[PDB]
Amino acid sequence: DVSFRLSGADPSSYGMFIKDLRNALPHTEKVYNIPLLLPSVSGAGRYLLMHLFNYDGNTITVAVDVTNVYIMGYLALTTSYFFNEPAADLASQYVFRSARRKITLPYSGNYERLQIAAGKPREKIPIGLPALDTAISTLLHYDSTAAAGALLVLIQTTAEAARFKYIEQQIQERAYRDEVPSSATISLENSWSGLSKQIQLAQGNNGVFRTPTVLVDSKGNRVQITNVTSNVVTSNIQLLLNTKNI
Ligand SMILES: *[C@@H]1O[C@H](CO)[C@@H](O)[C@H](O)[C@H]1NC(C)=O
Ligand SMILES: OCCN(CCO)CCO
């Protein structure tokens, strides 16, 4: 299990937390020096528990699927909460068994459904470490509309940061002041699966992508990614979704 304390947090300690989160995910191989997440893990080993603590020291524990870095659910005091989706339902067989009750949220965990439930897209929800403190505080007492927005923050500050160094750095820039995500950040979040697939396919195509991935860059410009020499592959992406799940 991995942990993070907002009390005393700084860019360096968040950086270390994201490094621990990445190093908690198992892999048997690397593809262009990037950890390749496992196609499958059976039973309880499929789930990592992230313990998050707000400024005041209250905690939630988040269950994360180690094969895709998807948040399945979380535990706040004695109540467990899971997305309304089969994967999460399964995960509820293995984690937080001791919760006094289990609530299924009224939405699945994908960004489209969360944005609907929250009533606004990601583009307009500020993220950062203070947003993450708020999110943990929100998740402590059930409120489904507010939780949707908290979950969008949680996702992007934990899973998306683990996936991409550029997003980790965005959050480090927002250690003491929230700000809406950059376009580039949204683009990468949306392209993870596609990037992962093409990087895997490039191994057998001399590092060349079968189909190029279009992204938005640091500057706000459309850019086309065609091979593993791109900075997105050499520097940015940190974990690959196994094509066995694409
Ligand atoms: C590989 O990608 C780099 C960076 O995007 C680019 O300059 C180059 O033209 C690409 N090479 C090939 C063979 O497509
Ligand atoms: O259950 C899906 C949860 N998942 C959705 C991603 O858009 C969050 C984890 O990164």
Side-chain angles (χ1 to χ4, degrees), residues 208 224-231:
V208 164
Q224 182 227 21
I225 309 309
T226 67
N227 57 90
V228 307
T229 77
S230 156
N231 274 123

Side-chain angles (χ1 to χ4, degrees), residues 5 14 19 24 30 38 46 76 78 82 94-95 101 121 130-131 147 160 177 185 190 194 207 212 214 244:
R5 292 185 159 79
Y14 172 80
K19 190 163 185 284
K30 295 195 193 184
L38 298 184
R46 188 178 181 86
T78 67
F82 288 89
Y94 297 102
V95 299
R101 85 232 93 207
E160 306 286 10
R177 174 180 58 184
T185 294
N190 289 341
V214 177
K244 290 182 203 168

Side-chain angles (χ1 to χ4, degrees), residues 69-72 83 85 109-111 155 159 163:
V69 209
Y70 283 18
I71 295 170
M72 298 298 91
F83 287 117
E85 74 199 10
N110 65 84
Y111 279 137
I155 290 165
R163 288 167 181 153

Side-chain angles (χ1 to χ4, degrees), residues 115-198:
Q115 280 169 171
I116 289 157
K120 37 167 42 165
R122 287 194 317 290
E123 284 85 354
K124 301 186 179 303
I125 305 174
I127 56 184
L129 292 189
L132 174 60
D133 169 78
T134 310
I136 291 160
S137 296
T138 291
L139 291 178
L140 283 174
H141 310 109
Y142 181 55
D143 176 322
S144 72
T145 295
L151 290 160
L152 287 171
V153 172
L154 174 68
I155 290 165
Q156 295 179 272
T157 57
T158 60
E160 306 286 10
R163 288 167 181 153
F164 294 105
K165 180 55 176 152
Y166 168 96
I167 299 180
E168 175 189 12
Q169 299 159 157
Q170 290 288 291
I171 305 309
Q172 289 168 312
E173 293 179 7
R174 301 156 161 73
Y176 311 119
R177 174 180 58 184
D178 301 331
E179 192 186 323
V180 284
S182 66
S183 287
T185 294
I186 295 279
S187 179
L188 295 167
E189 297 177 351
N190 289 341
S191 299
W192 188 57
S193 194
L195 284 163
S196 290
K197 180 186 185 155
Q198 303 295 321

